[PDB]
Structure formats: C-alpha cells, structure tokens
Point group: D3
Chain length 340, copies 6
C-alpha cells in the first residue's frame, strides 16, 4: 500500500490503471485494430513500469459504446475470442495480468437477446481466469443483458481479485459481496460519463474503507459523440486513502503498489474498523459484559435484506411506492422505456 | 436542499447540527445540569435561526462517555425520564423537533446487563416519536448492549426521518435499510473520535448519494480525558453534495434547508442515479429489448446477503476465515476481550 | 438544484455546458464546417442526456479567435444567418434550447468598424430569442466593438435567462444588473485563457451567491496557437455551491438540474441572505425599532455609482488617478494601444 | 504581498487579523474588562510579531452581541470614549495601528433610536482616523441603525484603508465604492455566524480580485449562547490569492505582509485584469480600431444602477416583484418584522 | 502505514500525536502540575488507543514559552529530573514510549548561558533513550542555546527514531542527516505559531517523501498571550501521503499505524524514488551503458555543501551577500538583535 | 509575485510555463520539425502574453524520449546546433528569453558514451547563456550520462536564474546549491511521468519555501507509448504559495509575474523564515544573550554532509546498509541493471 515508485517487490502487486480514451468505432475490423492498440499500450507501459503485475483498462475500451444496434450485434464478442487472444498475447509478452472489457459479449441466445457487458481477468500466461458480466447495467441508457454472479480469483502474487463494472459500484452491496467472498482487490472498470464525477471519485474511496479492500478504478476519458468521460482512474488503499489518482486527461495512467501482507495483517489484527469482522459479531463487548458469551450477534437486523432475499417482489413493490411504479417517467420520456 | 440562510419555508425543513463539546461527567446531578445546558442551547439557537425545525445533538452529548462502570450504571437513563423531559421542554419552547442522546439507556434487565446507547426524536410538542438503540456498538471499546431495530418517523413538515448512531454509519446496510423503509433524512449522531476523521466525512456523503437521502451528522468535539472528537458535523444533500459542514471547533453549528418537494421529485423522476429504484429493477432496458417484459430483475444476486439472512452462523464462519476467529487479537490485547 | 442524474422533471431545467475545444480556423467554409460539428454534438449529447433542455457552448466556439484581421472581417456573421440556421436545426432536432457564439457579428457599419462579439439563445423551435453583444471586451487584446445592453428572456420551462460573455463576468455590476432585471440563470460563455483559472472558477461561484442566481459557465479548452483555455465549465446553484464542474479536458461536459420552484421559493422566503431584497431595504429592523416605518432604506449610499451615473467622465478621471491615464502602458507596450 | 514571516519592511505593512472568541457580556464593567483583554492581546501580539503595523479585531469583539435590548442601550459606546481610550493606549504601547469594534455606538438620538454598529481605525499615536458605521445591517436579526458613508484613510506606511462590517461584504457595490475612492486595503470586520462559512471565505477572495485590492478579514469564533462564529480570518492579495487564513479556532491569528509598491505597480501597469481602469474604458481596442479615439467608453451601461441612483423607490418596487413586498415572510415569522 | 484503526500489530507501531494546548505558566510548581496533566493524558489516551506504542507531545507542551527571562531560568529543567520522572511513570503505566519537551533544559553553565530547548524519547520502561537539543532555534525570537547533534535510537518494535524541533524542520538538511543515519521515523515536535500554517503542513509531507521516512508532527494549539499555534499535528507515510492530520483544535489527537516491514521493503526494493540510495549512486544506468562500471557516482556535486563543510565562514560570507550582513534589520528592529 | 494578468512591468519578469505534449519521434528530421513547432508556439504565445519575458518548455519537449538506442544516438544534439538556432530565432522574434531541452546532447566521447540530458537558457538576443546537464538522471530507466555542475545566470530584468531537470528536484540539495549561489528563480524542466503527481506538485512548493526562491516548473503531458506525463506546470512564489498551476491538459500554459524587488526585499528584511541567512547563523539570539557575540553559529552540524564531502565512498557504503548494495533488485529486475 504505497505510492510513487515504478518498482514492485515480492510483497506488492504493481497495479496500473488506464484513463483510456474512449473509442468511437463501428466495425469489427475497427474493434480488432483498437484491441491491438491496447495490446501495444500494455507492452509499452511495462517497459516504463517494471513492477507492473496488473494492468486495468476501462469498460468499453475495446469497442467503445456501440450506440447503433446493428453494429452492437455485429461486433459482439465471443469469449475466448480474437480480442481476448490479442490481449492474452500482450499479457504474456509484458509478463503481466490484465483486465479488459468486451462490450458486448454475445448472449447465449445471440442475436436474439441483448449482449452482456463483460470483463476478463487474464493472467501472465494468457489464460482467462475470471469472466464477469455487469450485474447492474446503467439503465435506462444501458441496454446490456444483466449478469448474475460475482467472482473471486487468485491474482498476481496471490492477491484475491473481484471484478465489477461501472454502475455496479454505486451499490454498496456488490462491494460487500466481493469482500465477503474474500476479495482483497476490487477492480471497477468503467466508462463513467459526466455528470457524476465527484460522486464516483468519492464512492470508490468509501467502498475501499467500508469493505477494508484495495480498490482499482479504470475510467474512460474523452468525448465519443454522445458522452464525455471524466477519467479519475485511481488506486485506493484498504484504509480509504487514495494511493494515486488521474485527472480527466486522455490516456492518463496511475500506478501503485498494494501490499499482500498489509491487507492480511489488517484483516487479522484491526479492531475498531475491522468492518468485515464486526458486521457479523455485533456488540461483542456488551454481550460479554452482560454474561452472554463471546461472539457478539451475527443475525441480520435489517428487514430490507431479509425481505429482498425472501420476497424480492415485495421489496420491489415497496420501493415502487417510494419512487415510481414504471421504469420510465413521462416527465422525461425515453424511446423504448415505458412510462405511465 | 439549499445552504446559507437562517430562514426556512413551507417546503424546507431547517436542520441545525451541533458540534457539541464532549462532557466529562460522573454523577446523575452533573448529567442533569448538562441536559439543562443543552436545553438552553436549543432555545438560544432558535433565536438566531428562526427557520430551525430540527436540532441534532451528538451521541454522548448528555452524559459524555461513562468510562467508569459504576458511574455508567448509576447514570443510565429511563426513557421517558428526567433528561428527556428537560429536552422536551426546550423543543416546546423553541418550537422545534430535536434529536438527543441517552448513553446509557437502562436495559430491561438493568443493572444486570449493559445499557443501550439510544437516540430520541422529540417533536415540537415535546412528544418522543422515535427511540433508536445503536445496532452496531463501536466494539471493542463500546460496551453497550446492541439494539436490533431501525425506524422511520414522520418528522417536521412531514419529512421522514431515521436515526442511526456513530459506528452504525460505517456499514452501508443500515443506511439502505432506513432508505428502503422510506427515510428521507437519515440522522447520524456520533461521538466519533480521532483517528478516522476523513473517512467519516466521506462515508456520510457517500451514503447520502448511494441512498438518495438527505443526511445530517452531529459529531462531538473536544478532548474528554481519553478521546479527542473531530467534529465535522454536516448536512448533506441527496445528490451527495455537502450543504454545510463544521470544522473541528467546539460548539460549532451548521444549519441548512432541506426541501421536501425536491427529494420527492427526485425519487419519482430521477433515472440514471435513482439507486433505490434501480437496485430492484436491474437491467430493465436489456430485458425489454430482449422480449422479456418491462420490470427488470428484482432477485438478489449477492450470495453474501442470501447466506447472512438464511444462515448467519455460516456467514460468520466465512468471515472469520478472512479475518480472525476470536473477537480479540493477542497482538493488541484488551482486558475483557478474549483472544487466541 | 441537484446534480448527478441525466433526467430532468417538470420542475427542473436540465442544463449542459461544454468545454468545447477551441478551433483554429481561417475561412468561412471552415467556420460552417465547425458549426455543423457543434450541431452534431448537440444532437448526440441529447441522446445521452434525455433531460437536457439547455445546452451552452463557449465564446469563440464557432469561429475560434480570428487573430488575422482580414479573416476576422471575412468571417464575421450575420444574425440570423447561416451559422444560426445550422444551430437552430440542432435545437429543433434535439428538442433543446441552446446558447451559441458568433465572433464576430458584423457591425451595423461593417466592414468599417469592428465586429461585435455576440451570443444567441435559440429555443427548441429554432427561434433566436436573445442576442447579447459583449459589453466588456477583454481589452487590450480583444478588439471587438462593445455592446451596450443586457437582456432577460423566458427560457425552457419558464426559467428566466440572461447571457454574458467572458470578461463581463469579472465585473459584479453585470451580474447584478441581470439579476435585478429578473434573471434566474446567468449564462457566462467564455474563451477564458490561462493565466486566471482559479480566479475565474471563484468569480462564478461568488456571483451566484451574491445575486442569488443560478450560473452556467461554458469555457473553451485546448491550445489554439496563441492561448491555452482552462475549461472548468460549471453549473452553480443560487446558494453559491457548485453543482458540477469540468476540469481542463477538451470537450468535457457538465450537466445539472436547476429547479424553478427552488429559486422562486428562495427569493420569496430567504431572509438573511436574500441579497436582492436586502440591498434595497437596508436596516429595516433598526428603522422599525427606531419608529421609522417598515421598509428599510432604499437610497444608494455609494458615491461611485452616483458619480458614474451622473458624470461618467468624472468617474473616469477619478479612476485614472488610481491607475493610469492612457489605455496602454509604456512598461508593456502593445501595437495599436497608445501609452505615455 | 507575501506570507510566512513575522517581519515587515519599509515596503510592507504587517497586518495581523484575530479570530477573537466572541464574548457573552451584559454590563458596562464587563465590556471595559474585555476591552482591556483586547489591549493586552495587542501588546502581546506585537512582542511575537515585530513587523506588525496593523491589527484587526472582529465586529462585536468588544461587547459581544447585546441580545438584551436594555443591555444594548446601557452598553452603547461613545466614540471617542473609554473603550477607544483603552484601545488607543495599546496602539501607542505596541506602536501599531488597530481596528476595533463598538457595538453599539450611541445614535445621535440615543436612547430613542437604535445604536450604530461601528469600527474605528486608530493610528500608532492613539488617534482615531476613521469611524465607519455598518451601511448594511444583517437584517432581520441585526437591529442596528444603518450608516451611510464609506471612507478611505491614509494608513501605516501610507497604505490607503477602508473599513466595512460583516454583511456589507456580501454586496460587491461596497467593495467597489471603497476601491474607487482609492482604497488599497479593505478591512472586513465581522461576527459572521454559521451557516454561511464557505460562502464568506469565497466572497472575500472574489472581492480582492474584482477590485484589485488587498483584503483583511477578522472574524469571530466560538459559541455565544445563540450563534457559533466560523473564524477563517484571512489576508488576501489583490490578485485574489489568499496570503494566510485561520481555521475556526478560538483566538487564531493570521499575519501577512502587504507591499505598497506592488499594489501601486499593478494598478499602473496591469492590463487584462486592471478591473478598476477597464470598467471606465470599455472596448478601448475596438474603438481605436474603429476610428473612434482612444479612451474606450465610460458611460454606465447597466440600467439597475441608473434606476437605483435616479429613482431608488422604483428600484425597490422592481426588486419586490422578484422577491417579496414585505420585509418579513409569514412562512418564517420573526417578532417585530412585519409580513403579509 | 495505514490509518483509521485504534489497534496495532506486531508489524506496526501505533503512533499518537497531540495538538496540546499551549500552557501559559510562570512557576516551577505550575510546570510540575502541567507535567502531571500530560501524564494523565498519556494514560487516558492509552485506554482509548490500545495499539498506542508511541505518544508525541509538542515543543513547549510542558513549560509553555517562558517569555520572562527570570522565569525561564527559574523553570529550566534538569534531565533526568522531576518532569522526566513524571513522564516516565506515565510511559510505564500506559506501556508506551513517549516524546516530551523540556523548554528550557539547563545549560552546562546555567544560569550564565541560555538554556537548551530539548526533547526526550522515553521508553515503555521509563528510561530516557534519546535527548535532542534544537540545532536551529527559531531566531530572532527564540533565545535558546543551539544544540549540535542528531541521533537515531531503536524505538518500539525496533522502529528507528530521530527527534527534531520545530524550526529545524524548515531545513531539509536535518531530515536528510537523520535518514542517512538510519532513521525510519522522524518526529518533529513544535510550537509552531501562525503565520506559516500551510507551509509547515507541506514541509513535513515533502520531507517524508524526500527522505523516504515516516514523519510524526506534534504541534501546539491555542493562544498563549503572544502567539496562536496552528495545530495540524500529523503522521505521514514514507511515500509522502498523509496518514492522519489534526486541524487547529485544542487537544486534538491523531493516531496511525506505521509498518516496520513496509519501510524496510521499500528501502530495499524501491527504484525510481529510492532517494537515499540514488543520491549516492547518480547516473548508474548511464555509467553502466558507457562502460564505466556499475555503481553510479557518489561524489558530492554541490559546491555549497563542500564550501560549508571546508570553510563555514566563507559560506556565511557568501550568504550575507545574498541576504544581509547583520542578524537584525533596521527596517524591523528587535531589542537585543544588532542591525546596521 | 502576482498572478492573473498578461502584462509585466519593469519590476516583474513575466514567466510562461508550457505543459508541452510529449512528442514520440524517431528521426532527426522529425526532431527539427518539432523544434519548429516549439518556435512557432513561442511566437504565438507572445502575441497573447505581451508581458512574457521568459518561456519555459519541458524536458524532452524537443526530441521526446528516444527509447530506441540507435535513434537516441542518431538524434543527439550539438549545442549550439540546429535545434538551438531554431529556438534562438524564436526568442529574438518574440523578444523573450527561453528554456529548451536537448535530450540527448552528444557526450564529448559521442557515440561511445551516453548523451547528456541538457537544458539551455537563451536570451532575447538569441545567445545561449546557460547550459545545464541533469546531475541526477532518473535511474534506473534514465540512461543519460550525469552532469556535474549547477549554474546561476543573470536573466531578464536581472533576475538570477538556475536550471534543473526533473528528478534533480526530488533532492533538496540541488535547490539549496542553486539558491546559495544566488539564484532568484529555479527553473525545473521535466518529463515527469505518472505515478508521482501529487508528490511532485508538493516538492516544488516546498523547495520554493525552503530556499526562499521563485520556482517555475514546466512538465510534459500526454501519453507517448510508454509513459503518461501529468502536467501541473506551475509558477510558485518564494513564500511557498503557488502563483498559477496547470492541470494535466495537453499544451496547457501558465503565466505569472515575479517581482525582482520583492525577492530582494525579502532576502534583506525577512527574519523568522529567512532560511538562507539563518542556516549559517544558527542560534544568534541565544549566543548574544549568552555573551558569545552576534553572528550565531555557521559550522555544519550534520555528519552526513561532512562525510559525503570528505569520504563519498563511506557515505555510499553507509546508505547501502540502509537500502541495498546493488543498483538493481532481484525482486524487480531490469535488463542491464545488475542485482544480487
């Protein structure tokens, strides 16, 4: 957990995050050409950052956002496929792990259902070791089919990694789920457009803190014809302090060293802010002092979560009363999104 | 949702938060005397802030922290009781609602079990309308008996309020639970000691954002013989932007106007960052476009929460593998807290 | 007055501001081609920002700065003209109002007097509804002929709008004049070059506060051969708090929702910081308490303004004694600017 | 214009500003005792700050705010009087000029009209050389009788000084009036209560910039039974950059050196941001290039100011249409302030 | 190197720094009474911070500044002495190491020469293990006799510590000297008065970075009759990032965990910003590639340092030509300080 | 020492710094073409900044970084040479001094030893008046041959200038050496890549403060195939306060006026923070008061510097014990850099 050098040690994973300029592409050939640009960038970055063990690219960095539906379907990727092969060669040549974005990934019922929005973690041998599909698409605009699963994978030097995508990160639940499955690093890849710049910078730091986890964010930059992407790729310590952060600049990079021993030492020995431990051992001191044994309380005291788990339809009904009943609003209509 | 004036309108609740200097008290008479000081402060503040509809004091502001166990038991309060009567008179005289802290509140089995750490919301008629007991004591140091329930209550001008206490707020789950029960304002009262100043300032803003809720924080200040409390009481908009924030100064105040119509208009008409709605309607655009109807997906996709709800003991076992098995650590022992 | 979403409601005007990269152009055909690029950008932005009701481009965004005098005269625009027609079509297609810059606008005595530097507000029907000519050119470098008039126009959803241009905004008087004519939003379009970045970010916020008005700033970016433009386009609430702000990045965008009901509720019900009201009712409490009736004092107590209005030549003489008598200084001469 | 040392030179005025803890007093004897505390503080500060030439105390620092009307009248001061004599002795002993606050100063019709709220500038010989009465009381709460006049006085080392008080500074007009009368330093003394902390920090910097003037702010601190005062006393350069700023701490001090030659050199030789000059020479380059002579335009182009000067009642009527017609609002009533 | 918890582990030293309110004392008995207050504070802090291994108090925290020369001599301490015995008992009772300030420490020729300004490091057994005398008194005001020696001592958990005092830290040379002697933590104790707040916050961070060392700063707070002390006690990582920082509040505390293994791993394995290594191996890559062996260049290339070491009088003469020849300046005279 | 205008006076040097986009070049012809682009930029900037007296470009701005060794040798420059002639013509045409970067400059034994990394200061007559070779290459990656000498040269308006390059500035010793040779402005030209953005922004400010010197930084921007350069070119006052700073944007510019009389007045008359004077007059007050004469102590009290000067090999041995013995580390190997 230290910032400023280009090296890394046996104890630290050298993580680079890339403020990749958002492409605006239309064809499969254009997508392959840009994949090769990303590969070239990986290899060059390693020459400058000899400690680099993990390189992270934004959501949409391979395809850009395929606004045209026909082009979306025509460029949707297979995984493994040609794009991932190009990335895997770069990971081998640069002796690094990497996180890359396939937007779309063909649905099992392609082309008759929307593609997924997917990340892969590729190891330094070129092997795909995690494939994560966006659980929370950025609706209404995002038309991707939602995924359903989070994963944790042993990463470089044994650092445990989970992947999440852009809007996912507004929801504390996903960060919690990953950490509670053992993640030590949560990687948030995004094409996060203005407006919500300051809110997203803050969310990543808050979630690092709340889940006692390292966080790496790679966010797109530039204007793509529709959106301007605000950058601020970052690496954040498990104590909530930023390691390094980019600005809004195109093809900014940040690089930091995250210590394997430090996060493990914290998770064993931290007390007042060992959030993962404490959530499942509530009130341990008071129960001990009250003659009630020495584990605190584990039971979930939050009705929302009990209802959501038992009766998701009821939870949905409840929130519709607080918000609205239809996915659209007639005060700001959007074609294809129903309203009242 | 606007900052800088002392007025309030039919549409806005005028909220004041107080950086109350932490008392260091020992006797019931001292506690009553300080309760009367708080009452006097309420009445004076109203003369300066004619728009004030809600005034919020920190956790521990009535008793301070009763480090001595005998004094803790001797000063534990009944609710309603003498202290709350003193506060209620101030609320009536100043025509304001108020949030006050009773630390301890006698356990049902007092003095044979630890007191609760409790907040009350008192209306402008002097009536106690919410009583909240800290669900997440700040263990290991906090010896209070844990509460088990969150509440939402109709507040001034109909603004819906939930109360939470200090360490509670490190856990996104509580903020979510309150918002999903309909809270429009979450009030976090705390005696939040150094070290974790910047992390706590950030958490409140992140939770305002994540839950699309107003947030008011009242934090203690000063040194009490054990801890220094960092202040930074604040009022935060549902868009994640601070309204006003105190520094670390003793008896700082902040005051802001929170619009009832704005939060309700947002919750009806916001789309991309309508987090409450979107969590229970995932992927609506993609499902519509895929021929699958128009509600998105409600089901909880996060195994942590399903396991915690079904099998809290298993969730506890799982987190112990990531952290430690005992509530204490032998590398930093604390009397009364068992370790390996 | 809220930030982070892409929607807007019946109560809010969705405002986008654009960090438009400064063109460096030479011919009429180049200017038309870039006008069409701006039009395309409007239409694309609306696809990403369904709540957008007003889009704002910087000063010089259509022509760039025509440093060559012959090219300045050759490219000076008519209003209405070809450029405004191109913009108007975009406003209709995207169902948005827009603010665009014509630099120059032909003088009535063109080509025998310097062009004006002009902004237009175009409604969602394509109609030009305000045309504002820069009252305060950025002399010495700016050679535009000064305008003489501020305007207020009913905007989207009835939000009252005034336009100002770049250096205008250093002078509090213009902001006051617009607000006192009823403006609810003051739009400052600029090609504000380094050096004065931080000062300009601060001025816009201070003027929002001082005049209890929403403020939208669109500032250019990039290097144009002479100047680097610092961006930091922004939308600011009437309470002085930024809604959203860009960095220095080329073609950054910010987007915020400004509530019509909130500014009107403030202006009716704010008291201590109702600056517009209070300036014309000074000392009302003291006069009431002194037996002098209930309106305070309206009379202007500031001799500068009385002298400037009565005897502008005298005010000019007075300031020349404090500064210098000639428009130029011999310590830093500029061709065409006389000095002593 | 430089910060960090305790010295001063023939070219620099050493200015100290004091975050004076707000007194809460009731009697004339208490006021005299606190005046002597201020005197003692001046003398001690000079021993630590050998360059100090000017020391500035907040509004209300001598009396505090006399909330009780009888005590207000009983403690209202004569100027010169006993309090000013005590201050003058300190100025002589410490060989410094000083700015002190008399709240109230007896009205000419005392006790039958409200006192003024007054500042004095006392030279290093003990002589009162400026007496300024608050033109803009902080209504509704402030009950002081409004003053009507700004002044400029030759200060230490010949630095020209104007005094203003607290709410005055929200109105750009007063800062302009002082600068246009020749002020080189505008001193803003205040008891500026929360809420509006960040807005007031920004206003002082913006006004330094807009008027090309040094600014010194002395603001109270602490809680006085009604208000908490936010400190952030400061000294700001004529380029808008803070020299030094206090936090919210009681009896904080800041100290900076302001160069006489630098402000005069700027006002002679600055061009693009010579705001005082440029306001009365608008469009000089364009007029020269248009064959219209070499002074630009002096005439006031802002109808608000012409109307306010000609017909203050009309300006008042106009603003009442934008805001409200009565000094009070029935949505937030205040005793003694009429509403509809 | 992590912030937010109250624990510490075998790998981390828990460091607390104290924003101790500056005393204003006159007698030996008063000094002893305040020493006992510091002792009590240590013991209480340990009850709240079970990980605390090192507690650091400001310069002057025991005596305050003895402005009266007779009182300075009368209260000058012996080391070891009564004050250090009181501190040592607290260190034993709280099982912590501590850094305390004796101002003055009797000169060997007491009372015929000025006292030293001294820090002690006391271990958890009560033993004084470092005694450091201020090498750079804060002249002109500081009248202490200068010390001449820096030290490094094995600290808690083996962390190597050096002590420095207040003005020392403006001079990069001292930080370098300590680090090059092996310090892993440099403790800067200070009574750093306004004005230079922001400069001192920055210097400590810059020196942590430049010397690849942890830094702990304890700074006084409050007003003592002469000076206001700005606080901002802090703990900073060897990567230049703050761990935790206080504000200006009286008796603020910060607490952070500094990892022994992390600093040692950095100093072994960092490359681009291994400043200690690189200063003595300049240009190693270029020399290797040029056929010149594999150590880079060690020789000092900076004439200032060669001259200062060889011929301090010449270095002094040289700087007098750049600055002034006498310790005083006639433009800002100070009694006892000669000028021209 | 003032920021915001485009003018300059007889007392101020107008300094512009350029965030020059990093080239990625391969041939001599490409280098010449880019040199001509820099020349054109100088001339254009002067048209916008009539006060400009000094323009500063980053390290590598002429060649970029020649990663390919053959291309490095093929493009290494002579000084004077063709590139410097192109720059000199721009300096004459724009009537400005300039700082430009030649990377490489042929070694005396070219092509058999690595080139130097060199800066030139060119006056407004086109004459090269300083040539500085990087003393501290950014090893391990930087393969340039180290220089050995710092210089001070009379600059525009007589401002004394020293040049340093990028990694040099991490070492306080170089800044001290330049200031002690009489520098009034230290110019740091750099191609400073991410990661260490915030650390480098802080170092320049800290060194301005520590050495009581103006500082100008020109840093590259953009991505060059290997590195992303973070910009934040800046001009900083001798009091440690930034004048103006760029962001990360390509071809950003900052411009500030630095007063010759102010730095000289400070260096004569500052007392508490006259660091240059005080380092060679330690403890003057205490020695005077102790009967020991009136100059303080000049002798160097820091063993590191005495050892480094006397016995650089010993100093090297000492630091190797603290860090490592070989220039490389086997935990992060780099081809060509030996390790254990």
């Amino acid at each position: 957990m230290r910032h400023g050098d280009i090296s890394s040690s046996h104890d630290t994973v050298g993580i680079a995050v890339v403020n990749y300029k958002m492409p605006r592409l239309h064809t499969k050939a254009e997508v392959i050409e840009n994949a090769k640009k990303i590969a070239d960038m990986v290899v060059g970055m390693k020459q400058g950052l000899p400690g680099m063990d993990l390189v992270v690219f934004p959501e949409y960095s391979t395809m850009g956002i395929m606004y045209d539906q026909d082009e979306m379907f025509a460029t949707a990727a297979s995984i493994p496929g040609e794009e991932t092969a190009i990335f895997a060669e770069a990971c081998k040549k640069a002796d690094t792990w990497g996180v890359f974005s396939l937007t779309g990934e063909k649905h099992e019922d392609h082309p008759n259902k929307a593609p997924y929005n997917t990340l892969v973690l590729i190891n330094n041998k070129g092997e795909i070791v995690q494939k994560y599909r966006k659980i929370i698409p950025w609706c209404p605009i995002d038309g991707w089919y939602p995924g359903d699963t989070t994963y944790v994978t042993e990463g470089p030097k044994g650092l445990k990694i989970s992947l999440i995508v852009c809007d996912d990160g507004n929801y504390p639940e996903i960060w919690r789920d990953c950490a509670m499955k053992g993640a030590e690093l949560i990687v948030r890849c995004q094409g996060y457009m203005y407006p919500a710049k300051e809110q997203q910078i803050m969310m990543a730091k808050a979630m690092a803190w709340a889940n006692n986890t390292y966080v790496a964010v790679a966010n797109a930059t530039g204007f793509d014809g529709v959106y301007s992407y605000f950058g601020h790729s970052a690496i954040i310590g498990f104590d909530g302090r930023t390691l390094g952060e980019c600005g809004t600049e195109e093809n900014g990079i940040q690089y930091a060293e995250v210590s394997i021993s430090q996060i493990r030492d914290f998770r064993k020995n931290a007390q007042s802010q060992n959030h993962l431990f404490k959530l499942l051992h509530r009130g341990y001191t008071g129960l001990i002092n009250s003659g009630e044994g020495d584990r605190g309380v584990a039971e979930c005291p939050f009705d929302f979560y009990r209802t959501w788990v038992l009766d998701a339809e009821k939870a949905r009904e409840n929130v519709e009363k607080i918000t609205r009943s239809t996915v659209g609003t007639a005060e700001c209509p959007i074609q294809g999104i129903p309203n009242e």
